[PDB]
Nucleic acid binder design. Structure first.
Lengths: 121, 361, 117, 82
RNA sequence: UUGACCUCAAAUCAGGUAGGACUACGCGCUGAACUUAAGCAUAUCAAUAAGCGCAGGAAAAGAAAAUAACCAUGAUUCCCUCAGUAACGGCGAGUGAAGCGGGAAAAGCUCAAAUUUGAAAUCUGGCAACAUUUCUUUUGUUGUCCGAGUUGUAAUUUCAA
RNA sequence: UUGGAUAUGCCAUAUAAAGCGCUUUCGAAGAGUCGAGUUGUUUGGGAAUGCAGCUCUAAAUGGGUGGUAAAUUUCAUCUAA
RNA sequence: GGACAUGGGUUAGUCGAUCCUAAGAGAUAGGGAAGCUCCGUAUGAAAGGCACGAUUUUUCGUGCCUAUCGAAAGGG
RNA sequence: CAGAAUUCCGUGAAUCAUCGAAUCUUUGAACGCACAUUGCGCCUUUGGGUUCUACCAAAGGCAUGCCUGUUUGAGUGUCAUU
């Protein structure tokens, strides 16, 4: 069973050739399944399929992290690299421009803010 | 599938005419020619021109669709558009009389470098050294003409700068091999890194504008050659250890010779040929073993053909033969029933119209 | 000076797309490669007879594989040159390919080397 | 600042080589262009710019493209008596 | 002949945005008939069902071109009360609010109309830096060029002055 | 993971900005909009409560509203587009 | 047994579809309509090409004149 | 049911929970044109092979309205220069 962290400490070329080898093993196992295979081989089919998924996942994480680094501190980044919370949230006013105030309101709040007070009994 | 329409592949697909290339690239003809000069893009004639050009046989120039495709992603085209935008902004500033922003725009005038263009045009520096001769011929030709309104004085100054730097490099490296004196001028020949290069350097004379050439083509060729020549000299100085650009100021054939020159000889060529082989040169300020002087009336007194013949042959020539007032030896260029039956025995089998080639030539 | 009664709109410069970012962070891997083209060979009695008679292998093939992609996938997966490909979509909705091998190779050894006999 | 080629590169397929010279100069004995006694007498060739410009045009307008006794048969008619 | 400006186009131009679904509640538009009148045409059903458009977690309304006629009250909303009342109605069947009063909750304000004229002080965008993060996904600041703008962007004032 | 205080350090050019005080002073205030007639539709709104169409179309202590039409004169009240 | 159960089975450059247009449907331009949508189909549209030139004040000049869908019996 | 195992000197079973990284076929507001047609196209880059002007494959794209800006224009619209 391929361990995902051991995958993470390998190169893209090594991951690519391991993916091709894993695909070749999966092809041979499916050949056994159609020709009549044993329970051990049929059980190895699912493990090989999951290993291929793990290889493809690890490759994708490396590719997307490389894209994030390349597009770091850039004004425009790929749409899949941007936030996706909800469409409405994206359209909403940002906290900076929601807190923008006119010079009139700044002076009013500077000089006459809500005072903390209390009443004697 | 379907009946494929005729003319959808083959010559009609890979060859593209000049007008269609203009439309494809959205360039003017002037811009297209400039790109074709800067890059390596030349017309390529097909074997079946009628098939390539629809059905017509009128003379059209063909370019590879691959070459026209490659020019689509060239940054120089964008710089042409950016300069056109800049020029239009300058026209606005001058028209509205805003001299301050006119000076600001002139300072921020967009320029481009041929760093990339040289790289793909000459993949290796050996190739660049191979195709350098036309550049040297042009710059040495324009290094002597008077500066006019059409040509930039800066470009003229850069011509002599590049020419002087290369001549100094050859002198200090002793890379000169042959030198020919012809009516055209002086043809130098050098061998550096195994590459053979020959170029012509004309005399400085009071020429005149031919009034038939387009300096726009000269301008783009000059800027390309200056860009090419600058990096070539930069590689040469760095390879031999010196810094570039410098502050302008039989390898032992003439080593023990202190040549002195008179006021009638091409001192630019004489200094080059003598110092290329270690010879020391002295000259009159207005511009001793041997005194070069071609005047019929006046330190043995010799003539420049003696030096040039010595350069060509790698052997000291005859000073007495080349003495003043004596006939000059000619100057040589250093780089230069059965039969009848066979005549009518031409019954085919000689391929198609092939043997007459050799017979005629 | 106009010699035509019609006014055609002038041609303007059409700049090509020069985006400030890529819409996709990473280009997708080829989604239909050789291993996804070939699923598994068919080993029915009719398939076996085609092996021994027509020198033709029979494969269960992806739906979106054409005759060109089947040929390259077979050449890359098995290093055998097919001379013809015939495809059908079986009544269960799966593509079946008859790969006729070249006269220099025999389908019997190819079948044993695959191991589905 | 004017560019002076401050950096190197190491950290046209067919050039159509120009024709060479055919040994015509001031006073060659091969054939007799014009003969001149001295180099000073020789004027400046006015058309040199024109030929150089013609070379410029050929660089980007001219298309670039880059023993015979076997062709006759060997019937040997000499021995043919008739 | 060059230019300036206005207007109008084009681009797979740089960067954005709109649609569709859900629709209990919310804002409009459009809009019936069954039914009641012991018939029926006004009326009623009903400013309803269906149809159409557009939002939010609430929406709408909201700081008086508001009541009142008092010793005056004081944005809006909801609740109880006014009140099945005043009024409307083949004055027939039927329909029908509001002020005050009590409470829940409370919060106020922003422009246009002014010469900055001893200085468009305002703003978008590109580029280059730094910075910040629900976040390498977010949000900015500074510099500098192009632009928008005098047919008016800032500061200043809003009737309570 | 947030909140409001604190306990401090640093950047903060308050030449500035603002509240209050009396002025023999001036004081800009939204138009095919108010309003009027008429026609539909609405309302509890009754010589029209709102809305909409069309015609006519102001004003400057002016213009709304004070739930019976109209003219004149006062009094309150509010300050629309 | 056309039932029931398990398997197997349909191979195309040349046969059809695909291509073409028919009657007709139908976006765009525009005009209606509170709207849903309606009318419209070269119309009150700036509705797209093509060739020349040493390269033109190295900021392009000079000429030349209709979507789409719709036929497995039509066309091919 | 088969099957493995994880030793039990753990990075680890599980049709487990949880979930902030990804994947997400053909579609559909559905966006290249269509669609009782796995139909018809175009643009850029790249690659492939006993075949290299051919053929094929892969990746990324090409809807409409509108807004700010950019670039390229149009006009017997207003004028200066001349």
């Amino acid at each position: 069973a391929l361990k995902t962290f051991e995958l993470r400490k390998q190169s893209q070329e090594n991951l690519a050739e391991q993916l091709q080898e894993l695909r070749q093993e999966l092809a041979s196992l499916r050949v056994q399944k159609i020709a009549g295979g044993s329970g051990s081989k049929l059980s190895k089919i699912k493990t090989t399929r999951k290993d291929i998924a793990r290889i493809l996942t690890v490759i994708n994480e490396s590719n997307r992290l490389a894209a994030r680094e390349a597009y770091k501190n850039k004004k425009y980044i790929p749409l899949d690299l941007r936030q996706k919370k909800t469409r409405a949230i994206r359209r909403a006013l940002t906290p900076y421009e929601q807190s923008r105030k006119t010079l009139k309101q700044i002076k009013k709040e500077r000089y006459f803010p809500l005072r903390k007070y209390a009443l004697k009994a | 599938a379907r009946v494929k329409q005729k003319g959808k592949a083959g010559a009609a697909r890979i060859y593209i005419t000049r007008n269609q290339a203009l439309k494809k690239l959205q360039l003017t003809l002037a811009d297209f020619r400039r790109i074709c000069i800067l890059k390596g893009v030349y017309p390529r004639e097909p074997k079946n021109k009628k098939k390539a050009n629809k059905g017509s046989t009128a003379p059209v120039t063909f370019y590879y669709t691959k070459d026209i495709q490659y020019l689509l992603h060239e940054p120089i085209v964008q710089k042409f558009r950016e300069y056109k935008v800049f020029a239009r902004k300058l026209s606005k500033a001058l028209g509205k009389g805003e001299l301050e922003t006119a000076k600001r725009l002139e300072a921020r005038k967009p320029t481009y470098s041929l760093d990339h263009i040289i790289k793909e045009r000459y993949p290796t520096f050996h190739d660049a050294l191979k195709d350098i001769d036309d550049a040297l011929s042009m710059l040495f030709l324009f290094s002597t003409m008077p500066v006019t309104d059409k040509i930039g004085a800066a470009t003229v100054a850069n011509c002599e700068r590049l020419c002087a730097e290369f001549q100094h490099y050859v002198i200090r490296s002793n890379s000169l091999r042959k030198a020919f004196l012809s009516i055209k001028g002086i043809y130098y020949q050098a061998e550096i890194f195994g590459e053979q290069i020959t170029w012509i350097v004309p005399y400085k004379f009071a020429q005149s504008v031919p009034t038939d050439v387009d300096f726009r083509i000269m301008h783009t060729f000059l800027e390309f050659y200056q860009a090419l020549m600058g990096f070539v000299n930069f590689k040469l100085y760095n390879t031999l250890g010196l810094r570039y650009p410098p502050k302008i100021d039989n390898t032992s054939l003439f080593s023990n010779f202190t040549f002195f020159l008179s006021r009638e000889v091409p001192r630019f060529s004489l200094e080059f040929v003598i110092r290329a082989f270690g010879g020391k040169v002295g000259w009159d300020p207005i511009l001793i073993t041997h005194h070069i002087c071609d005047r019929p009336h006046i330190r043995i007194y010799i003539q420049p053909q003696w030096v040039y013949d010595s350069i060509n042959k790698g052997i000291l020539e005859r000073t007495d033969l080349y003495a003043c007032g004596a006939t000059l030896p000619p100057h040589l260029s250093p780089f230069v029933k059965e039969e009848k039956e066979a005549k009518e025995l031409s019954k085919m089998m000689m391929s198609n119209k092939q043997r007459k080639l050799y017979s005629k030539l | 000076v106009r010699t035509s009664t019609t006014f055609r709109r002038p041609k303007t410069l059409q700049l090509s797309r020069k985006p400030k970012y890529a819409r996709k962070s990473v280009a997708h891997a080829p989604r239909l490669d050789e291993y996804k083209i070939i699923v598994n060979p068919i080993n029915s009695e009719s398939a076996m007879k085609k092996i021994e008679d027509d020198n033709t292998l029979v494969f269960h093939v992806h739906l979106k594989a054409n005759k060109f992609t089947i040929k390259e996938a077979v050449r890359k997966l098995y290093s055998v040159e097919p001379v013809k490909i015939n495809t059908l979509i079986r009544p269960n909705g799966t593509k079946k390919a008859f790969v006729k091998l070249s006269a220099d190779a025999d389908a019997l050894d190819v079948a044993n080397r695959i191991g589905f006999l | 600042q004017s560019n002076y080629a401050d950096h190197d590169l190491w950290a046209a397929p067919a050039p159509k080589l120009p024709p060479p010279s055919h040994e015509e100069s001031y006073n060659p004995p091969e054939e007799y262009p014009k003969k001149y006694k001295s180099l000073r007498v020789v004027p400046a060739y006015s058309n040199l710019i024109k030929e150089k410009f013609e070379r410029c045009l050929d660089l980007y307008l001219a298309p670039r493209v880059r023993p015979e006794s076997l062709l006759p048969k060997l019937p040997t008619p000499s021995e043919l008596r008739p």
